[PDB]
Symmetry: D2
Subunit: 119 residues, 4 copies
């Protein structure tokens, strides 16, 4: 149930296709920051999750460069998919910017996004 179009609390749009062997591919559009239009994303997910009530672990990356801009940074989202009447993807992310070795201590931002199918 991972395949589809998802939105997070910020209005960003996440469009993924989950492959049978565990691949994630699609595009991401951020509603905030130095970003414009769509960006390519790639990731992986557990294609054979536990039988109990556990969620499905997954993660994907986005390098913020496309035909319009390049913010010289990348974000990785790590979390888990929870199915049901109202499916959700709960994640925590790391946004690393390219920096000089002198500013490397303040290169990574951390946060959390929650995706649902309701625009």
């Amino acid at each position: 149930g991972i395949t589809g179009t998802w939105y997070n609390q910020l209005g960003s749009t996440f469009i993924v296709t989950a492959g049978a062997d565990g691949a994630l591919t699609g595009t991401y559009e951020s509603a905030v920051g130095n970003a414009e239009s769509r960006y390519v994303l790639t990731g992986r997910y557990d294609s054979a999750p536990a039988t109990d009530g556990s969620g499905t672990a997954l993660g994907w990356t986005v390098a913020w460069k496309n035909n319009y801009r390049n913010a010289h940074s990348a974000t990785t989202w790590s979390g888990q998919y929870v199915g049901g009447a109202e499916a959700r993807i709960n994640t925590q992310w790391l946004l690393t910017s390219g920096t000089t070795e002198a500013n490397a201590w303040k290169s990574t931002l951390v946060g959390h996004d929650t995706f649902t199918k309701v625009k």
Copy 2:
């Protein structure tokens, strides 16, 4: 410069190929945890980084499932590549395990790996 074989402080193996369109593909071998043999990885990087002293932002994902074992989890590495005689990849990572809704608060581990390029 990113393309090659790398190893982190734990003795883990990272073999990657950086595509011209910003894609990263390869395999990862962890020296620790519930894992064995090689796992597929996919990521993205900044294919047009700043021509200054800044690092190259990148990130990649590994879902801990192959033809031999499944740990129902996924790790994402976010960081930057710093070129030169002694090429290094400094990262911070998030490892999320699939869990029941009740144990969700303790599903994500955080850490940091430093990779050194071989030969």
Copy 3:
């Protein structure tokens, strides 16, 4: 408006007293994990925040040991207080457990809690 009794999405109870010079003191009671009853907490906060619409940065620590149990770990919450008709404290935390140097790679959990005054 920081002083008072707060609750997070897990049902945990946070009781703080903000001192004029920026000190935070109180007790914490977790609704989950190897915890029982109240634990002492101490922290700091910006006692002279910006004039614009910015929140108030703050943070506190809790070592999980009291008269009843000792989980040999500590959590630090870092975030910001947002006042108004419906005040909230948005945070992200790091839970570090004491471990052998061999398991140090999986010693820290990361998450996020949102506190409000509604039990």
Copy 4:
């Protein structure tokens, strides 16, 4: 063993005293960022750690405001103390800045510091 003067890889200074009730108090001096002189710190640690080869869990907070400067932010260090001839404190930290509700997604930086005890 925790009580003393420490320094991290950035050249920052950490002077702390570990109380018998699990309390940590002292001052911190950062070698980088929008800060100058000493800042008050407070934290907690496990005063009854495991008698094995495990580290001692601890954490502390610093709100970046003193009688000379105010950066409207707060950092929390979470980690463990490892005793011996070469005592070390390995940490991971969260630095949260006060921001308007619109810039909240980029309010928290994440990193890691390693402290070495002097003399």
